[PDB]
Amino acid sequence: HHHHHSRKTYTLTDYLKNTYRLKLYSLRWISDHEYLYKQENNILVFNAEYGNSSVFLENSTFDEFGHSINDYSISPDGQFILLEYNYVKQWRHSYTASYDIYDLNKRQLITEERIPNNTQWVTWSPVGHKLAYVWNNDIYVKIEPNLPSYRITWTGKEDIIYNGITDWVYEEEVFSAYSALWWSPNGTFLAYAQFNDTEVPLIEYSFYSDESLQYPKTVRVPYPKAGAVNPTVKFFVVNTDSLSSVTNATSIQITAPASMLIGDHYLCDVTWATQERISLQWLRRIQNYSVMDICDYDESSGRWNCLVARQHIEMSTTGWVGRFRPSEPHFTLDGNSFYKIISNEEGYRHICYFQIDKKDCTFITKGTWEVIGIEALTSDYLYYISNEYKGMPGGRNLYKIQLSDYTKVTCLSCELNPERCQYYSVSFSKEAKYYQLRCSGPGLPLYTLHSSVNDKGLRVLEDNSALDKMLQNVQMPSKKLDFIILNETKFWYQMILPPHFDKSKKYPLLLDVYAGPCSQKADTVFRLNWATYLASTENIIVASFDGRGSGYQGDKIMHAINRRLGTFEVEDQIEAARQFSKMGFVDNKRIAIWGWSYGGYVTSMVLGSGSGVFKCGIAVAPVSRWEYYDSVYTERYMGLPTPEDNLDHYRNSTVMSRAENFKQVEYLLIHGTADDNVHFQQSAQISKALVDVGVDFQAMWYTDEDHGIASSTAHQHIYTHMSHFIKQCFSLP
Amino acid sequence: RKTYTLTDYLKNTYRLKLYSLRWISDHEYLYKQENNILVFNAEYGNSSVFLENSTFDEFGHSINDYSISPDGQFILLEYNYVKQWRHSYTASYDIYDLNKRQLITEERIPNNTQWVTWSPVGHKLAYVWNNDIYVKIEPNLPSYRITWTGKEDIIYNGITDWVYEEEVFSAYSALWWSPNGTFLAYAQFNDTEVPLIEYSFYSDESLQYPKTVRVPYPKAGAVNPTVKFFVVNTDSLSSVTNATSIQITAPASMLIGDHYLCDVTWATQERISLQWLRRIQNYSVMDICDYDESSGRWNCLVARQHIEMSTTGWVGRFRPSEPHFTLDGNSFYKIISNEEGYRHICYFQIDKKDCTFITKGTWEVIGIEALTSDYLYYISNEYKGMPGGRNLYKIQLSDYTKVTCLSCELNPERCQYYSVSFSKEAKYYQLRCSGPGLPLYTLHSSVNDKGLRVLEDNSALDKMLQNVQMPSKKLDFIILNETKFWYQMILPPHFDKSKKYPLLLDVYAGPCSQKADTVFRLNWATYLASTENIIVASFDGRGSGYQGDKIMHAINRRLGTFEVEDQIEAARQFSKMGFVDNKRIAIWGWSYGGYVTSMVLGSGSGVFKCGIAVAPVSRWEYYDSVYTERYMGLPTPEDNLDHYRNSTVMSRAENFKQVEYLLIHGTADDNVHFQQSAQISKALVDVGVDFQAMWYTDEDHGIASSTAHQHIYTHMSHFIKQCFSLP
Numbered sequence A: 001h002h003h004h005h006s007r008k009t010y011t012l013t014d015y016l017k018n019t020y021r022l023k024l025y026s027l028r029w030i031s032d033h034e035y036l037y038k039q040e041n042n043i044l045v046f047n048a049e050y051g052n053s054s055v056f057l058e059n060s061t062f063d064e065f066g067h068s069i070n071d072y073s074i075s076p077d078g079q080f081i082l083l084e085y086n087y088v089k090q091w092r093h094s095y096t097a098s099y100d101i102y103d104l105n106k107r108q109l110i111t112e113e114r115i116p117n118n119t120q121w122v123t124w125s126p127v128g129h130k131l132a133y134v135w136n137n138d139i140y141v142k143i144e145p146n147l148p149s150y151r152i153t154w155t156g157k158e159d160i161i162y163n164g165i166t167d168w169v170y171e172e173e174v175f176s177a178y179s180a181l182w183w184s185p186n187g188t189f190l191a192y193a194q195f196n197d198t199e200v201p202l203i204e205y206s207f208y209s210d211e212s213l214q215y216p217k218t219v220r221v222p223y224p225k226a227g228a229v230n231p232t233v234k235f236f237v238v239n240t241d242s243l244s245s246v247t248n249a250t251s252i253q254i255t256a257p258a259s260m261l262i263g264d265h266y267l268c269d270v271t272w273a274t275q276e277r278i279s280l281q282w283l284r285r286i287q288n289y290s291v292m293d294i295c296d297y298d299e300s301s302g303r304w305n306c307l308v309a310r311q312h313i314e315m316s317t318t319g320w321v322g323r324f325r326p327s328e329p330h331f332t333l334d335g336n337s338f339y340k341i342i343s344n345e346e347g348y349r350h351i352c353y354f355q356i357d358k359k360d361c362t363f364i365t366k367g368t369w370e371v372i373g374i375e376a377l378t379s380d381y382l383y384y385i386s387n388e389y390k391g392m393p394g395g396r397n398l399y400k401i402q403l404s405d406y407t408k409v410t411c412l413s414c415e416l417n418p419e420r421c422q423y424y425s426v427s428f429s430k431e432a433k434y435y436q437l438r439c440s441g442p443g444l445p446l447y448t449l450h451s452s453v454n455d456k457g458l459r460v461l462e463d464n465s466a467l468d469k470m471l472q473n474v475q476m477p478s479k480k481l482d483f484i485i486l487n488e489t490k491f492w493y494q495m496i497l498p499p500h501f502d503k504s505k506k507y508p509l510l511l512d513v514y515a516g517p518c519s520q521k522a523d524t525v526f527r528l529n530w531a532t533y534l535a536s537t538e539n540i541i542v543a544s545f546d547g548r549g550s551g552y553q554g555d556k557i558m559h560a561i562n563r564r565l566g567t568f569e570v571e572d573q574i575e576a577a578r579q580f581s582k583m584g585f586v587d588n589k590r591i592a593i594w595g596w597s598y599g600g601y602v603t604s605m606v607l608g609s610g611s612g613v614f615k616c617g618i619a620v621a622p623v624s625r626w627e628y629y630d631s632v633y634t635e636r637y638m639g640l641p642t643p644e645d646n647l648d649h650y651r652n653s654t655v656m657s658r659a660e661n662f663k664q665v666e667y668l669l670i671h672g673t674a675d676d677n678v679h680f681q682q683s684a685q686i687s688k689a690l691v692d693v694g695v696d697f698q699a700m701w702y703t704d705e706d707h708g709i710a711s712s713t714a715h716q717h718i719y720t721h722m723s724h725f726i727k728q729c730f731s732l733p
Numbered sequence B: 001r002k003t004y005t006l007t008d009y010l011k012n013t014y015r016l017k018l019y020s021l022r023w024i025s026d027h028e029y030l031y032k033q034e035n036n037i038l039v040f041n042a043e044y045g046n047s048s049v050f051l052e053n054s055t056f057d058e059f060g061h062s063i064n065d066y067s068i069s070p071d072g073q074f075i076l077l078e079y080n081y082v083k084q085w086r087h088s089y090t091a092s093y094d095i096y097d098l099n100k101r102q103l104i105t106e107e108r109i110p111n112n113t114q115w116v117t118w119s120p121v122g123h124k125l126a127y128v129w130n131n132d133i134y135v136k137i138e139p140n141l142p143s144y145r146i147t148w149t150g151k152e153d154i155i156y157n158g159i160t161d162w163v164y165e166e167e168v169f170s171a172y173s174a175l176w177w178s179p180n181g182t183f184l185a186y187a188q189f190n191d192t193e194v195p196l197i198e199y200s201f202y203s204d205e206s207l208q209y210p211k212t213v214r215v216p217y218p219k220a221g222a223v224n225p226t227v228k229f230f231v232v233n234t235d236s237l238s239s240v241t242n243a244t245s246i247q248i249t250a251p252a253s254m255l256i257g258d259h260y261l262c263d264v265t266w267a268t269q270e271r272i273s274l275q276w277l278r279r280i281q282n283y284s285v286m287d288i289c290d291y292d293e294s295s296g297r298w299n300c301l302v303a304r305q306h307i308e309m310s311t312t313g314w315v316g317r318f319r320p321s322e323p324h325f326t327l328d329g330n331s332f333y334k335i336i337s338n339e340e341g342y343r344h345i346c347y348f349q350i351d352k353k354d355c356t357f358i359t360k361g362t363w364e365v366i367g368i369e370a371l372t373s374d375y376l377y378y379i380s381n382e383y384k385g386m387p388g389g390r391n392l393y394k395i396q397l398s399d400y401t402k403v404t405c406l407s408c409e410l411n412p413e414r415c416q417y418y419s420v421s422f423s424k425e426a427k428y429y430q431l432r433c434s435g436p437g438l439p440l441y442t443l444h445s446s447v448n449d450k451g452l453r454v455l456e457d458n459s460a461l462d463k464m465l466q467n468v469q470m471p472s473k474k475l476d477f478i479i480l481n482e483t484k485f486w487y488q489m490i491l492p493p494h495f496d497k498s499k500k501y502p503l504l505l506d507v508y509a510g511p512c513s514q515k516a517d518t519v520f521r522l523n524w525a526t527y528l529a530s531t532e533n534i535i536v537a538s539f540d541g542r543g544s545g546y547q548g549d550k551i552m553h554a555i556n557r558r559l560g561t562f563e564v565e566d567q568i569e570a571a572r573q574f575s576k577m578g579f580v581d582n583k584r585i586a587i588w589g590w591s592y593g594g595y596v597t598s599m600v601l602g603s604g605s606g607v608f609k610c611g612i613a614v615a616p617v618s619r620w621e622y623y624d625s626v627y628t629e630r631y632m633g634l635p636t637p638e639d640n641l642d643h644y645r646n647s648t649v650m651s652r653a654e655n656f657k658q659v660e661y662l663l664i665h666g667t668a669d670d671n672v673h674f675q676q677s678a679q680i681s682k683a684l685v686d687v688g689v690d691f692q693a694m695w696y697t698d699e700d701h702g703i704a705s706s707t708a709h710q711h712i713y714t715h716m717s718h719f720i721k722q723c724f725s726l727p
Ligand SMILES: *[C@@H]1O[C@H](CO)[C@@H](O[C@@H]2O[C@H](CO)[C@@H](O)[C@H](O)[C@H]2NC(C)=O)[C@H](O)[C@H]1NC(C)=O
Pocket: A155, A161, A196, A197, A198, A199
C-alpha cells in the first residue's frame, strides 16, 4: 500500500554506477547547413533545415581496421577523414595518438607516407585538406594526405623546445590546449608558437604504474612554480603554399613588442583577422599590462609587419587583465574592426567595438550585468551570451545585438522555456545560419536547433524525456538560488535541498567550496552529482557561495582578492556558513566544508581559521602554499614571491602555518600521487605540519591518480570514502 | 589506580634505566653518569672522573659521541651527526690530546667523514671520506691515502653500500684492523650497474621543488653490487709512493657466479678468515688466509677452505655465523646446524673438514660470547626448554660435559633473558637481564664466577609502577601437528578469564623471528592492555627462530604461506581459550609483520575484524636481493617466479571487502619502499574495497621522528578503539 508515492531516492550507487543518465546532443557543424551525429555508433549527416539523416559513415567500416578508433576528424572539404587511435593521455589537453587517413571518395586507407606513431597533434587546414602535425616537437605539413610531409621545424627537443605545441603551463594556463598551431582562414599560412623550457625547473614525482614495474618511474615535467624561471616564446608564420621539396621551409618571425620584450612576457592569444592579417596578444609576467599587435603580411617583403599605430593596450589598475587572460578579438569580415570583451569603467565586462586605427573603442553593451562570451558575428548581428536576464549572474542567455543600432537587442533564449531553462550555450553553423542551443538547467538539459534568419524554433534534438521518466517516483532534491547582502553588495549562494525540505528541522550542512578567482558556484545549472546523493539520500543540505573574488559580477567583487589569496574568499565562506545557520534550518553542531583543488585550499584555510563554525572537512588535491603552484595562474593573483613584491603574503597564506587550529576539527586530506597540476607535495607538506603539531586527521593518497582522480575505480572509491567520513562526521547511521 | 596511558608510552613517563658501559681494559670500564665520563674499577666499584662534562664547553658544537684510542692517549670527538640509513651516517671529527690536554688543529679529519675507527691497539686512525680510505699513524700528521677509486653511489672503499649495510654486515664500516693494528683489511663495493630506487623527498616547507632521492638498491633478481677484498700494510706506508693494497680474491667455488662477502674475521696477527656466500644462499665457503713473507701477499690454502651449506634452507640464521679463534688461530668455534637441525657450537681445526660438536640438544646456541684458554662462554635458550629465554653458560674446553649455567639461578623468578659483555680478556663480565622482571644489570668476576654488585636494579622504576595498574605477560605454547609453538599474551590488569576481551594479534613472523619471549617491555601493547583492556598476543609459528631448522626452514621458498597460516591458526586457538571476544580479534604489524597482517586480512578466513599494516612488503620482487633471495630464490621462471607471483598481497585485494584495514607508510622509506604500499592501495581501489590510509611525509621505515612516532601510534590507537567499540 505504497499508493505510488515516491519512496526511491538518489543513492550513492546511482551516482557511481550512472543509473540516471543525462542524455546529450553532441554535433559537429561541417558546412553551414549540415552537422554530424553518432547514432548506432554510425555517423549520420543531418540536414538542419529538413531532418535528412542519410548515413554518412557506417560503424562497420573500421573493425577491419584492427584498433579501437578513439576519435575522428572530417577534412573541411568533406573529402577525407582522419582516424585517431592508440590515444594515450598526457595533461589536461595533450596526448599522443596514431593516425590514419581514409580516402572518403576512394573508400580506402592511405597506406603511403602515413602520419607517424606518437604524433602529438594533428590539424586540418580550415579549407581543403592540408595537414599540420607535430611529431617529436617539430611541425610537419602534408599538402596532400598521401604525399610526403614537409618538415617545417628542425629544433624540437623533448621537454626543452616545443614547436607548435604548448609546454605544461601554456597548456594548462594560457591556451587550454596542447595545440599551438593556427592556420590562416584559406589555409595559406600556418602560424605557430614555439616554447623554450631550457632553464625551467622540473617537478619530479614517482609513477608506480602496473604492479609489474619493479622500480617506480620518476616523472620529470618542466613546470615553473611561482617565481621560478618561466618558458620563453617565439612566434612564427610559415607560408605553406611556397613549401619546397628541395629547400627547408622559411619560417617568418613576428617578435613581441618593445614593451613586452623588456621583461618576462607571454603570448596569451593568437587570432587570424584575414587571409593576410593576424592579431597577437602578449602579456607581461606581471599580468596587469597586455598589448594586442595587429600584423599584416607585406607582399613584396614576404615578411610580417605590426605597425605601432595598430597596437592596442589593455591594462587594469584594480587587478589583472581579463577573466583568466585578455579576451579574444572577433574581427569584422574586412579585418578593419573587431569586437572584444573588456572591463568597462565600472569594472563590468562588456563588448567593446574597436577600430584597427583608433585607440578608444565604444561599448555596444552596458549595465550592472556581464557579457560571458562573443559567439558569432555576421554583417548585421553579433551573438553573445550574458547573465543579464533577471539580473542574476548565475544564469546564461543568448542575445543578438544589431550592429547598426545598439539599443536594438533581442533575447534569443530568455523566453523559450523560462521555468525549465535559464543557462544556455550555443553552437553556430559555419556562417551562423543555424544554431543549436544547449540549456543546462535548472530543469533537465534541453537541446534545440534554430535557424537564425528568423530566430524560429526548428526541432527538439534531445529533451531528456527518458531521464524525466526515470525520475518521476524518485525523491530528488530541489535547488534554491538566491543572494544575501553584505556591505551593500549582493552575494549569491545555492542550496541543494533535501526532498520534502522542512524549515522547522535543523539539517546538517556541507559547504561545497571552490571560491577561486572568477569562480561561480551559485548558478542555474542542473546537476546529478555527489551533492545530489547527499541531499536526496542522506538529508544533508549542500550549499555553495560566491563571495569576494568570484566572477561575472564585476571587477569590484572579482578583484577584491587581488594580491590577497587566502583572505576574503576564505572569510566569505565562513560568513556564508554563519548566514546559513542564522537562516534557521541548519544544525550548528554539524556544518562541514569540502573542496577540490583551489576549493581544497579554501577548505583547508577555513578549517585552519579557528572560527569554531565547522565540525569537519574534506580537502582534495588542495594548494597548501602558493609558491608550490604554477607561475602564470599564481602570479596573476599573487605577484612574485620576492621581498620587493608580495613575499609577505605568500608566507602569510599557507595552510601549514595554520596547522595548530586543526585540533578543533576533523580533517580528511586526499591527493593523487601523480598529480602533475597541484603536486602531491602540497598535501605532503600539509600532513607533515599537522604531524608536527600533533593533530590527528584522516588521509588518503591515490596511487598514480592525477588532479582529476578520474579513473573509474578511483572516482568511485574517493566518493565512497568521503561519504563515510561525512556520514560518520554527521552521525548518520 | 591510574593506568599506563598512551601519553605515558609516547612521552616516556616511566623510563627503563640502562647501564650502558664500555670496557677499556681487562678491569676498567667507562660510564656516562651525568654529562661526565668516569672510569670505574671492577675490582672495587671506585672510580675517578676521566673527562669533565664542561671541558668541551669551549668547543661550541654539540658532542654526539666520543671514542678513546686503545692506549688511552686520545679522545675522538664526533659532532655534526647526519643520519643516513640504519647504521650509516656522516659526521665531523676532532681529536683531543690527553697527555697535553688540547685539541689537534693540524691535518684535521675532514667534514662529512663516513667512518672513523682506531686501530685495536695504540692510536692509529683509519677513516673513510668521499668513499676513499685514509690512515693516520699519528692524530696530528698527514693521513696517507689508500684508495683513489671511491665515487659517490658507485665505488665504496671501506664502507658498505645500501644492501651490504642493511642486510650483510649490519654496519656502515667495511674496515678490519688486524689484532695489533699492523694490517688494514677492507672491502670494496661496486654499485655501477645496480638500479636506483627513486623516491621524492619533500623536505622543509621552504623547499619549492621536491628532491628526488636516488639510491642504488638491488631488488629481487636485479643486478647486485660486486665486492673485492683488500689488505694493506699500515706499518710500511710511504709519504712518497701510493700505498699498495693486496687483494684476496674469492675462492673458485664463489667466482663461478654472483656472490657475497659475508664475514671478515682476523684469526691472528697474520691470519684472516673470510666467509663468502653464493647468491643462491645455501652454500658458503670460509677461506683462511695467511700473510706470506717472501712475496708480501696473502695465500688462502684451498685445502684450508671450510664449506658450510644447507640442503633444507639457507646458510645461517640471517648469514653464516662468525668464527671465534683460539689464540694460536689453528682452531676456531662456530655455531652451525647439527644433523638434527639445531644450531650448536662446532670446534673446527684449521687443517681438517670434520668439526666435532661441543654442545647438543633440542635448544639452540644464540651466540658465542667470549673464549679464553680454559673456557667457552655462550648464550642459549636451553634452560627449562624455553626458546624465548636467554642464559649465560660456560663450557669447560678440556671436558665438554662440564657446562655451568652462569645466570640461570641468579634470579629464576625475575630473570630469564640475559645478555653479557665481557672485559677485554674476559676476567670480568656484565650481565644484562632484560626480563620478565624489570631489567637488572650486574657485574661479575670470571675466576670464581661470583657476583660483585648490582649496577642498576630499576628500583626507581619499581616504585612508580606500584600505584599504576600494569598488565601481565603469559608466555606459553600450544601444540600443532605434534609440535610446540610458543605464544605470549599481554593480559590487562585484574584479568578475569570468564570475561571476553578484545584481542590484538601483534605480528612479525619473518624467518628466524621470535616474538614470544621473556623480555620485559613498556610499549604500545602495554598501553592497550593497561588502559584499553585489549589482550595483545604474539605467536611464533613456522619460520620462527631459535627452535631448529625443521621449524625455521619450514617457510623456505614459500614466504607468505606457512608463517601466515599459523597466525590465523594461533588466533583461532586463542578464540577457543574462552576469554577472547571473537567478534573483536584484530591483527597488526610493521615491515614483514605488515606483510603478514596484510596477507592474513586478504585470506578471507573471517577470523579477523580489522588490521593495521605499517610499511608492509606487498610483493617480494619489490624488496632487496640479499634478504629476499635468501628465502625466495630468484623471481625467474627457472627458479621461484610462480611463488613470487602467488605471494602478493595485491592478488588478495578482493578479500579485504571482509575487513577494516589501515595502511600506513612513510613516503621516504629507503627500505620497504612506499611503492609496496602504493601498489596495495591501488589494488584495493581497483576492486572497490574501502580502507583507511596514512602516509608519513619524509619518514622512513622507522617512522621515527619524535612527532611522527607520536602521531602514528595515536592514529592506530583511534583505529583499534573504533574497531573494538572502545570510546
Ligand atoms: C632556448 O634558450 C636557451 C637559453 O635559455 C638558448 O641557449 C643559449 O644559447 C645562446 C647562444 O649560444 C646563449 O645566449 C646561451 O649561452 C645559451 N643559454 C643556455 C643556458 O643554454 C637556446 O639557444 C634556445 N633554444 C632555441 C633553439 O631556441
